[PDB]
Design a binder for these strands. Structure first.
Ligand SMILES: O=c1ccn([C@@H]2O[C@H](COP(=O)(O)NP(=O)(O)OP(=O)(O)O)[C@@H](O)[C@H]2O)c(=O)[nH]1
Ligand SMILES: C[As](C)(=O)[O-]
Ligand SMILES: [Mn+2]
Ligand SMILES: [Mn+2]
Length: 333
DNA sequence: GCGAGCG
DNA sequence: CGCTCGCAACGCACG
DNA sequence: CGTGCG
């Protein structure tokens, strides 16, 4: 019952416990072996190209999703020769040797370690100080769901990006909301990219004020879709495209076209369904890397909000007080 | 899930 | 030699 | 101290 060895594109990867249940609800389809089988099916394809050279955090469940959840940002000092690491710097100044996705064996090793979900930073190593991706995180609040997420993405955010001359790429998160990624030239730092995300989010909110909120404070959000602008800060990740999530049916964060997203149901994309869905279908994100976009149009939105008196917004807990950050508390008591 | 180190 | 146990994220601002 | 928030 000893370990076995997988051959992943020339690299030998150790593999154990194929029949350990990770997702109790799926029967024969919820074992660690089924997870590794999924990742072998996607790890050599667009998942890899989307993750290439990014530092990632691991969300591991060595005892399955009902056991303890272990987030992990550091790779152990002692690790297999084929693994590559990269130094990322947190807002405090502390650092971490994070996994760098360079090869499908990186993804397979992560899955052998119990990783259900990979969580990339928005940078490419070794240029870890300049995001190449601006990321929009759409979060339905209680009383809203995926339908609101997809409606706002398709009917407010998409036409707005069109107006601004920008191209965005959507995916299901695998939870109840939506992610939209914009590829940018790595010319700006985390502060500038987060401000550009704030101005984009504020414009979406102005155009759909009954449906959309940017309030960090839960009290002021209402039954609206929250655009989580702090996900563009340093030391903030997104679940990767094609990652499985810790939901009971093992949903997958699924890249879609705008046309597909209009009618999507995230429960259709599972570690059990996704490989068959990918076959006979063109990659909707095939072109994400063909244009490295400028942040200019969004930075002009920033300047125009400044003209109307709107500046920076609060950061999350555990961040140092940032330059220009307003009081990190809910307002007007 | 792994590995240092203890009985 | 066989086993247990520690360990595997980020850690401040505000009243 | 409790509470903020992914
Ligand atoms: O505790 C956490 C929560 C979230 N995150 C990271 O922040 C991202 C967004 O946090 P999120 O709660 O919005 N989750 P998401 O994957 O967007 O699903 P959903 O909002 O239900 O549709 C996640 O995808 C993780 O990468 C963490 O790193 N730690
Ligand atoms: C985004 As989660 C892993 O706290 O459901
Ligand atoms: Mn989200
Ligand atoms: Mn969020």
């Amino acid at each position: 019952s000893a370990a076995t060895e997988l051959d992943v594109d020339g690299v030998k990867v150790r593999f154990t416990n194929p029949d350990k249940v990770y997702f109790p609800k799926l029967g024969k389809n919820g074992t660690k072996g089924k997870l590794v089988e999924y990742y072998l099916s996607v790890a050599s394809g667009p998942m890899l190209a989307l993750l290439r050279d990014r530092p990632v955090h691991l969300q591991r469940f060595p005892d399955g999703i009902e056991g303890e959840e272990i987030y992990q940002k550091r790779v152990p000092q002692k690790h297999p020769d084929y693994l590559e690491t990269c130094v990322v710097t947190f807002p405090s100044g502390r650092t971490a040797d994070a996994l760098k996705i360079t090869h499908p064996s990186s993804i397979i090793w992560a899955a052998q370690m119990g990783t259900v979900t990979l969580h990339p930073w928005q940078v490419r190593c070794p240029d870890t100080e300049h995001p190449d991706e601006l990321r929009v995180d759409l979060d339905p609040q209680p009383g809203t769901g995926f339908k609101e997420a997809r409606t706002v993405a398709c009917d407010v955010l998409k036409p707005l990006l069109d107006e601004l001359g920008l191209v965005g790429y959507p995916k299901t998160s695998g939870g109840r909301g939506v992610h939209v990624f914009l590829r940018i030239k790595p010319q700006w730092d985390f502060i500038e990219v987060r401000r550009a995300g704030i101005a984009l989010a504020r414009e979406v909110e102005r155009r759909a004020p009954d449906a959309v909120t940017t309030s960090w404070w839960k009290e002021e959000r209402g039954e609206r879709l929250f655009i989580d602008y702090n996900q563009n800060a340093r030391d903030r990740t997104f679940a990767s495209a094609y990652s499985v999530r810790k939901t009971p049916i093992a949903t997958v964060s699924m890249p879609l076209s705008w046309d597909e997203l209009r009618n999507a149901d995230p429960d259709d994309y599972t570690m059990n369904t996704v490989p068959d869905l990918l076959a006979g279908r063109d990659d909707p994100w095939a072109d994400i890397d063909s244009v490295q976009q400028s942040l200019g149009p969004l930075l002009d939105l920033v300047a125009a909000d400044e003209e109307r008196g709107l500046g920076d917004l609060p950061y999350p807990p555990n961040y140092p007080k940032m330059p220009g950050e307003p009081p990190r508390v809910q307002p007007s008591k």
